[PDB]
Amino acid sequence: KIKHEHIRMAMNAWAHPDGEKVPAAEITRAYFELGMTFPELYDDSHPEALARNTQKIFRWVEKDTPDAVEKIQALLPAIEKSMPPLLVARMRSHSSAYFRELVETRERLVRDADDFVAVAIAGFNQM
């Protein structure tokens, strides 16, 4: 349904700026919000919960063993309810033409927004 590799790209991109602890904090929020139990993550009742849940989650992301793949696959729901819509969209655009068009439209829009800034800049220099 969604290749582990591509779940990895979106996961690394989500953690690109503020580190891995943000996506982990969010995913874990959702996870417990959804009443999940698989894979197992530590709740706030545990000493360094976040740091530990962060290492567990990203270890699975990086590994490629059938085990890893199964745990992240079970985590997709918490991921999808947590991850930035745009990233979720990019993650699914590999296995879906719909999401692929959604990301392509948005990108076409951002380019045009920037072509506007460009034409607006030159032209201002032309006083």
Give least dist CB 37 to a copy of itself, A.
22
- Kindly tell me which of 42 and 99 has the beta carbon lying closer to a copy of itself: 99
34, 43, 85, 95: which one contacts a copy of itself (CB under 8 A)?
Answer: 85
25, 30, 52, 99: which one contacts a copy of itself (CB under 8 A)?
Answer: 99
- Kindly tell me which of 43 and 104 has the beta carbon lying closer to a copy of itself: 104
CB 9 within 8 A of CB 83: no
- 94 backbone dihedrals φ, ψ, rounded to 5°: -90, -35
Give least dist CB 46 to a copy of itself, A.
31
Round to whole Å and give the CA distance between 96 and 74: 20
**Two tokens at 7?**
């779940």
CB 67 within 8 A of CB 38: no
Lookup result for tokens 């199964």: 70
- Kindly tell me which of 66 and 122 has the beta carbon lying closer to a copy of itself: 122
105 binds a copy of itself, rule: CB under 8 A: yes
Round to whole Å and give the CA distance between 27 and 82: 6
Residues contributing to the site for a copy of itself (CB under 8 A): 84-86, 88-89, 98-99, 101-103, 105-106, 108-110, 112-124, 126-127
